Amino acid sequence: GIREKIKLVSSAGTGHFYTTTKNKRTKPEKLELKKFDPVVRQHVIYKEAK
Amino acid sequence: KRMRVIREKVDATKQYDINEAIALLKELATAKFVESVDVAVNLGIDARKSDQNVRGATVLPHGTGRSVRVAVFTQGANAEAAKAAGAELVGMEDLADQIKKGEMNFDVVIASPDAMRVVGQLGQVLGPRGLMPNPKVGTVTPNVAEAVKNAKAGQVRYRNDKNGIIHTTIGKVDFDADKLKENLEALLVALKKAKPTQAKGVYIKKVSISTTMGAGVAVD
Amino acid sequence: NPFIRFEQDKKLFRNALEVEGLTKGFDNGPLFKNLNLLLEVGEKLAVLGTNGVGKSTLLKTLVGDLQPDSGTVKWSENARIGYYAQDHEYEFENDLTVFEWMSQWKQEGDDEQAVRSILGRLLFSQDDIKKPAKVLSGGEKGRMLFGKLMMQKPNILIMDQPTNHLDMESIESLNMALELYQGTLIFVSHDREFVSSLATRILEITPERVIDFSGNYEDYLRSK
Amino acid sequence: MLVSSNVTMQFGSKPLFENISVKFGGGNRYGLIGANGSGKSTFMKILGGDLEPTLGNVSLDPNERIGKLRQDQFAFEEFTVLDTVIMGHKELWEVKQERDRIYALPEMSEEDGYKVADLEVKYGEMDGYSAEARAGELLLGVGIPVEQHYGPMSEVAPGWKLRVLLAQALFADPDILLLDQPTNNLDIDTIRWLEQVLNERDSTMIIISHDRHFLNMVCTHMADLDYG
RNA sequence: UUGAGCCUUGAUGUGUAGGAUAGGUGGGAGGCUUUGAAGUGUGGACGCCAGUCUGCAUGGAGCCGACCUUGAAAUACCACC
Ligand SMILES: Nc1ncnc2c1ncn2[C@@H]1O[C@H](COP(=O)(O)OP(=O)(O)OP(=O)(O)O)[C@@H](O)[C@H]1O
Ligand SMILES: Nc1ncnc2c1ncn2[C@@H]1O[C@H](COP(=O)(O)OP(=O)(O)OP(=O)(O)O)[C@@H](O)[C@H]1O
Ligand code: NA
Numbered sequence: 184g185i186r187e188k189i190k191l192v193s194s195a196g197t198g199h200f201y202t203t204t205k206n207k208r209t210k211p212e213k214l215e216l217k218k219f220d221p222v223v224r225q226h227v228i229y230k231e232a233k
Numbered sequence: 234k235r236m237r238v239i240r241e242k243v244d245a246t247k248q249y250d251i252n253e254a255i256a257l258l259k260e261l262a263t264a265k266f267v268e269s270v271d272v273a274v275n276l277g278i279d280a281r282k283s284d285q286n287v288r289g290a291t292v293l294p295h296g297t298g299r300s301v302r303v304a305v306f307t308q309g310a311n312a313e314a315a316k317a318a319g320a321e322l323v324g325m326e327d328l329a330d331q332i333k334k335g336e337m338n339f340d341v342v343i344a345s346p347d348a349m350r351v352v353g354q355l356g357q358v359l360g361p362r363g364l365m366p367n368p369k370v371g372t373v374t375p376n377v378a379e380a381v382k383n384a385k386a387g388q389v390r391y392r393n394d395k396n397g398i399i400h401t402t403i404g405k406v407d408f409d410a411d412k413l414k415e416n417l418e419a420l421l422v423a424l425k426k427a428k429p430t431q432a433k434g435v436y437i438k439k440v441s442i443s444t445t446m447g448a449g450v451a452v453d
Numbered sequence: 454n455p456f457i458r459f460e461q462d463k464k465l466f467r468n469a470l471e472v473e474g475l476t477k478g479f480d481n482g483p484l485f486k487n488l489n490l491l492l493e494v495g496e497k498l499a500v501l502g503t504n505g506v507g508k509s510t511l512l513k514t515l516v517g518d519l520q521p522d523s524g525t526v527k528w529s530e531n532a533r534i535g536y537y538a539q540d541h542e543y544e545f546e547n548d549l550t551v552f553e554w555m556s557q558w559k560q561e562g563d564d565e566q567a568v569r570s571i572l573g574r575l576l577f578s579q580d581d582i583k584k585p586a587k588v589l590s591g592g593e594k595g596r597m598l599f600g601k602l603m604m605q606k607p608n609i610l611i612m613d614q615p616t617n618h619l620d621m622e623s624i625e626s627l628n629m630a631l632e633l634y635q636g637t638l639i640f641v642s643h644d645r646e647f648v649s650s651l652a653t654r655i656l657e658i659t660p661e662r663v664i665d666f667s668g669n670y671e672d673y674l675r676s677k
Numbered sequence: 678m679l680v681s682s683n684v685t686m687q688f689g690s691k692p693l694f695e696n697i698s699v700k701f702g703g704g705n706r707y708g709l710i711g712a713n714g715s716g717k718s719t720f721m722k723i724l725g726g727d728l729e730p731t732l733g734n735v736s737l738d739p740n741e742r743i744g745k746l747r748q749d750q751f752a753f754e755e756f757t758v759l760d761t762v763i764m765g766h767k768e769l770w771e772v773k774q775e776r777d778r779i780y781a782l783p784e785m786s787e788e789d790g791y792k793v794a795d796l797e798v799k800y801g802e803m804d805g806y807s808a809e810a811r812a813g814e815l816l817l818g819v820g821i822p823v824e825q826h827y828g829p830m831s832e833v834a835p836g837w838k839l840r841v842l843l844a845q846a847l848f849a850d851p852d853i854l855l856l857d858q859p860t861n862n863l864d865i866d867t868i869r870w871l872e873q874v875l876n877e878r879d880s881t882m883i884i885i886s887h888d889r890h891f892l893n894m895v896c897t898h899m900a901d902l903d904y905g
Numbered sequence: 906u907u908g909a910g911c912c913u914u915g916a917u918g919u920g921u922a923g924g925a926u927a928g929g930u931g932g933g934a935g936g937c938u939u940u941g942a943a944g945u946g947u948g949g950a951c952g953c954c955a956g957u958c959u960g961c962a963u964g965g966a967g968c969c970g971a972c973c974u975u976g977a978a979a980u981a982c983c984a985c986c
């Protein structure tokens with residue numbers, strides 16, 4: 184409800200994304216996490232964009 | 234007189250033929266002069282858009298009829314090559330700032346990376362009337378000898394107005410009607426080849442060949 | 454409507470300004486020559502003219518950050534001056550929060566109230582008392598200046614051009630605050646029905662003749 | 678015609694304007710109102726494209742040269758009076774500043790030869806030969822005489838600082854977005870001069886002024902931005 | 906009568922620095938003047954009110970262009986808009 188839904192789009196070029204939830208009113212700031220990207224088979228950085 | 238008789242003698246509404254027009258232009262012959270005739274083509278482009286501007290050149294088998302001071306204002310190998318290739322001067326800064334004011338002007342100006350002084354030596358007056366070296370035109374290139382050779386061979390350059398009508402040097406009236414064809418068609422072919430890929434619609438509508446003192450006629 | 458109210462730290466009695474001769478100049482012949490006048494703990498004297506006369510530099514000379522070529526101004530020994538500059542960019546700098554900027558003032562006040570309360574009396578909340586000071590916009594910066602004046606509590610308010618970026622709903626709030634304020638002030642606002650609203654000692658300034666104190670300024674504009 | 682397509686902006690922790698969309702285009706003057714602290718200038722920046730929204734698209738006009746006036750009339754104090762106006766046109770000012778790295782760099786390379794060759798050509802296309810010729814005449818037309826053209830912007834009364842900042846936006850201008858044009862309050866003679874200048878020439882305009890009488894005399898629409 | 910689109914023709918347009926109300930594009934320096942001029946008197950319309958401008962006879966055939974302050978070059982003309 185209050186926690187909106189966001190997707191972390193991979194930064195390896197391929198189209199892949201993990202979907203989570205983020206409290207969208209504390210301050211606007213994208214999530215940066217290093218998560219596995221199966222298409223390229225490596226641990227890359229995941230910036231968020233819905 | 235002429236302005237009031239040629240107007241009724243020649244009608245610009247009817248589209249003439251190449252062979253009829255080349256003869257009629259020489260047939261007018263009202264005033265005595267060198268009669269350096271030229272052309273004007275209504276290109277179909279949007280000169281409002283930067284990328285659809287068509288500034289180019291082509292090497293003509295008849296040149297322009299006169300030679301200019303085509304020198305390479307870049308001291309070094311390019312200037313050394315141009316001096317023996319037949320420029321109007323050498324490349325130095327003595328004629329760019331201390332002589333760029335005293336010296337009136339030359340015909341053309343090529344540039345080289347050895348001494349890029351001409352990029353500011355002209356300032357506002359040297360290239361204010363179209364004397365700067367175009368990076369895409371090939372004037373500002375290391376091959377000073379090649380640039381001088383092209384200038385001697387007679388590469389005529391053309392540009393656009395704010396609406397997209399190209400007029401440029403094509404040759405004098407001293408060259409015969411048969412010789413006019415491998416200039417007109419050569420220029421048209423070069424323009425067609427260099428036409429931008431973003432040229433929507435019909436890009437050539439009207440060609441008009443005109444005299445320096447006489448009027449112009451619709452060729453096609 | 455931002456609730457703004459200007460208090461008085463210490464009430465001075467005899468008179469405040471008492472200026473004799475300024476004759477301030479920058480490049481041309483001095484924008485004014487004498488401007489001898491008194492205050493008598495009055496109200497306003499709404500300096501005004503046209504653009505480029507030099508009312509802002511007159512106020513600069515009065516407040517003392519610019520000194521005249523030769524002359525004397527002087528204030529009462531108990532005079533506390535609050536200043537609202539025509540341009541205020543030297544103030545909103547050094548990357549402070551709204552809370553930190555508003556707390557850098559204040560004489561003897563608790564950090565949590567009487568400084569987070571003067572902020573809420575003028576359109577601010579918890580989500581806004583943490584944004585940087587150098588990012589607020591126009592009327593908000595002007596309102597912050599009003600808040601600093603409310604906490605400094607000065608006797609004399611110089612207040613160059615207060616109605617610049619206000620809401621047209623903060624304009625009358627400031628109008629009421631000024632007419633309920635019991636100190637001394639000057640201001641050079643160009644608004645018609647602000648000087649017409651409260652002015653009493655209007656002083657016009659011109660490259661040749663500096664008029665002074667016709668009255669309500671309605672009588673001034675009527676005589677003119 | 679510039680269009681906003683579901684534009685939202687979130688400053689801090691609460692959205693400023695929620696999912697706005699409206700069409701601007703024509704010889705009309707959409708003066709917009711709103712309490713200070715609520716959109717207005719941020720929406721103007723979004724329309725100008727300097728700042729992007731958190732959600733939505735600018736849906737910009739192709740190459741129609743959005744011409745803008747800023748809220749700050751004191752942000753220009755080091756650039757001279759004849760410098761600000763010529764800096765108003767971006768693609769000219771940027772090319773001029775880059776070409777200024779010729780007399781200041783005593784070393785030139787092979788690539789730099791091509792770059793100096795083509796940047797001068799671009800300057801000629803962008804009319805650098807008349808860049809300062811078209812600016813002084815406009816500055817004299819607005820009412821700023823010659824004596825202060827090369828003087829610094831600091832030594833100017835703000836009523837004339839605005840007079841020059843307005844002329845800074847007058848270079849082949851469709852779609853002029855004017856931020857707060859009064860403030861540093863004009864006498865009233867300058868205000869009527871403004872209103873006649875603005876309502877004589879025909880273009881698409883967006884005013885944000887707070888002056889009710891000025892807005893009445895100028896504008897035909899009111900793009901109020903109040904609730905959400 | 907009032908709009909919008911097209912064709913043709915005619916009017917239409919400064920600076921900063923001037924002998925001068927210079928749209929570019931540059932082609933060029935010699936055309937233009939008597940199929941009646943230089944300048945004289947007669948006025949239409951426009952007019953950052955200084956001037957363009959064209960009906961007009963007579964007076965009868967010089968003026969212009971170049972140099973020149975200048976960002977630009979000049980109704981020396983024409984085509985392209
Ligand atoms: N970069 C920013 N980051 C966070 N908050 C901001 C930022 N810029 C402005 N704000 C705040 O969010 C709101 C947006 O300010 P904005 O510049 O849009 O105001 P405005 O309505 O145009 O004001 P004014 O009428 O005074 O010109 C204001 O309340 C301001 O305090
Ligand atoms: N530092 C300065 N150097 C030179 N001249 C200045 C300076 N400051 C101001 N002036 C000149 O003094 C005159 C008035 O300046 P001032 O800043 O006082 O204007 P003002 O009359 O208050 O107008 P406004 O506030 O509307 O800008 C103007 O002619 C201005 O050019
Ligand atoms: Na002032």
Ligand code: NA
Pocket residue numbers: 590591717718719748
């Ligand atoms: Na704002």
